[PDB]
XYZ file of C-alpha atoms in Angstrom:
39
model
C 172.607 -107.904 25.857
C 173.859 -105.155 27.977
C 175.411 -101.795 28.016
C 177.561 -101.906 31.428
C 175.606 -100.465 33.555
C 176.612 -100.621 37.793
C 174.382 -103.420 39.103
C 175.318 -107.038 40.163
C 175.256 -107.067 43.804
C 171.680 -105.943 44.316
C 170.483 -109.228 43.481
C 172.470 -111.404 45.364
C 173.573 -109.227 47.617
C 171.353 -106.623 47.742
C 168.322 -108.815 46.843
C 169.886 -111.475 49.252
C 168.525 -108.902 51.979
C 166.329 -107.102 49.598
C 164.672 -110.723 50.014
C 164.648 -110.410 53.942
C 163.176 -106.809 53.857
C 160.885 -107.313 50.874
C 159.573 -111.036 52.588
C 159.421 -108.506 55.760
C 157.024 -106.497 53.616
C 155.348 -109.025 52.738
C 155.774 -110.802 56.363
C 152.689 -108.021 57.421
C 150.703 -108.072 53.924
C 152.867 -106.084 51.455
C 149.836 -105.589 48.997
C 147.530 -104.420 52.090
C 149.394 -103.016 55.325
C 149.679 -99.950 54.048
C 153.340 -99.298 51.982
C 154.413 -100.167 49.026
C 157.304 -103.254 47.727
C 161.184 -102.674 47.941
C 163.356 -103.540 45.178
């Protein structure tokens, strides 16, 4: 179910990079360099 909303491209799109940034987060530790995950 949904309610509208304004997402779609954030996950695909967004997430498509999110993906790049959030591996990049991860590409020094994520869960132990010293920030937290993107979206």
């Amino acid at each position: 179910h949904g309610e509208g909303t304004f997402t779609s491209d954030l996950s695909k799109q967004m997430e498509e990079e999110x993906v790049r940034l959030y591996i990049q987060w991860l590409k020094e530790g994520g869960p132990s360099s010293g920030r937290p995950p993107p979206s």
